[PDB]
Design a binder for this molecule. Structure first.
Ligand code: HEM
Ligand code: HEM
Ligand SMILES: NC(=O)c1cccnc1
Ligand SMILES: NC(=O)c1cccnc1
Lengths: 191, 190
């Protein structure tokens, strides 16, 4: 059992529903074709997760203002916090590819948003860290999380055309999710 | 261009150049991207109309998106659509041609304000829906980025050149939408 991973058993119902999701999927051009290709992406990425995680953790670790969000008050990285989050982050890669984007998925999207936001940050792992991750950086991270995925999608010998379809599905899915995570950040009624 | 007030905004941006430096690092934007975004402008300048038609065609095909240009009776305000189109067209050029400096940041705050209820519908003096839900600005990062790709390949540049121009475009779009969250975000959570 992954500590803190509460998919399917969240405290709250999401403030967005399956009709909201339908319309947001339309805004990111996500269709049944992307459902298929995100699943195929999962098959390609599954045994590569550790190397993907090292790439993403390496990026954050190389910028003091980014590693900042995992630090103790003394400004040093909380290693227990980093490790605990890494397990759930790893599972998120699989979820994106393997879960149906249903109400349970949406409820967990709200949860992940709440956990980056001051509402729930630091509570899952019971750590003393910085209180909030500025929303500017969640949007910003759409780029690195999307673009640095591409070389991994090509590592199993798939053609550039099939890599392109898996990559676009990943881009769309990343964008869709960060959009949802904006909810706890955005003034009530403005989301 | 009616309503276009770049360099002449009545507010200073709440984010400064040090904020921009750090956000550029977050989207992996470097001097290389500075070069390639400028090169993208050279490629895209005389393609703006076809680019606009694609983006407008996407919005027009979805009632929940075209919604944001509608009059209270639910019918599209074509004057609103046309006036915005001119400033949207200029935005494409600005992204490629402006230094990302204080003037640029000031106008980034302005564009955010104009999507938000703070200033939406004031620039063109129209009556339309009061706010554009922030969910859709983030969402639009995908279509605004992805649909640009074919246009960057249309002037005979090499695949490596096209890819670099496209990555620069992706970074810049992401960067800008991040900034535009400011008026939407609960005070102190940005
Ligand atoms: C595309 C953007 C992002 C993605 C896909 C992402 C992914 C994730 C995931 C899957 C989790 C675990 C959720 C769970 O508890 O099950 C998480 C938590 C976390 N992430 Fe992110 N994240 C993003 C943006 C950011 C940014 C910009 C930072 C700043 C360094 C960051 C730092 C953190 C921290 C500190 C936690 C732990 C939060 C807590 O205390 O519960 N994330 N992220
Ligand atoms: C990547 C995301 C987006 C980009 C790059 C973008 C770009 C722009 C630009 C450049 C302008 C003109 C700014 C100026 O006044 O100089 C504008 C205004 C406008 N956009 Fe967007 N936009 C985005 C998201 C959206 C979305 C999701 C909608 C919903 C349909 C939308 C609808 C509008 C409307 C209605 C205006 C006029 C606002 C006003 O009354 O001032 N935009 N946009
Ligand atoms: N490195 C990252 O992008 C990251 C790691 C853990 C949680 N959220 C984001
Ligand atoms: N079509 C679009 O994405 C669009 C058009 C005008 C303003 N903002 C966004």
């Amino acid at each position: 059992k992954i500590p803190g991973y509460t998919y399917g058993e969240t405290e709250n119902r999401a403030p967005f529903n399956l009709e909201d999701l339908k319309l947001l999927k339309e805004a990111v051009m996500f269709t049944a074709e992307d459902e298929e290709y995100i699943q195929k992406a999962g098959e390609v990425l599954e045994d590569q997760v550790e190397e993907i995680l090292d790439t993403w953790y390496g990026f954050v670790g190389s910028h003091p203002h980014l590693l900042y969000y995992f630090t103790s008050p003394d400004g040093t990285p909380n290693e227990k916090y980093l490790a605990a989050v890494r397990k759930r982050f790893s599972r998120w890669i699989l979820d994106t590819s393997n879960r149906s984007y249903d109400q349970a998925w949406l409820d967990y999207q709200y949860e992940i948003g709440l956990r980056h936001h001051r509402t729930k940050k630091n509570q899952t792992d019971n750590v003393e860290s910085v209180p909030n991750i500025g929303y500017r950086y969640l949007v910003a991270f759409i780029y690195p999380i999307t673009a640095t995925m591409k070389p991994f999608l090509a590592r199993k010998g798939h053609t550039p055309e099939e890599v392109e379809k898996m990559y676009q599905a990943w881009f769309k899915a990343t964008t869709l999710q960060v959009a949802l995570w904006s909810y706890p950040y955005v003034k009530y009624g403005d989301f």
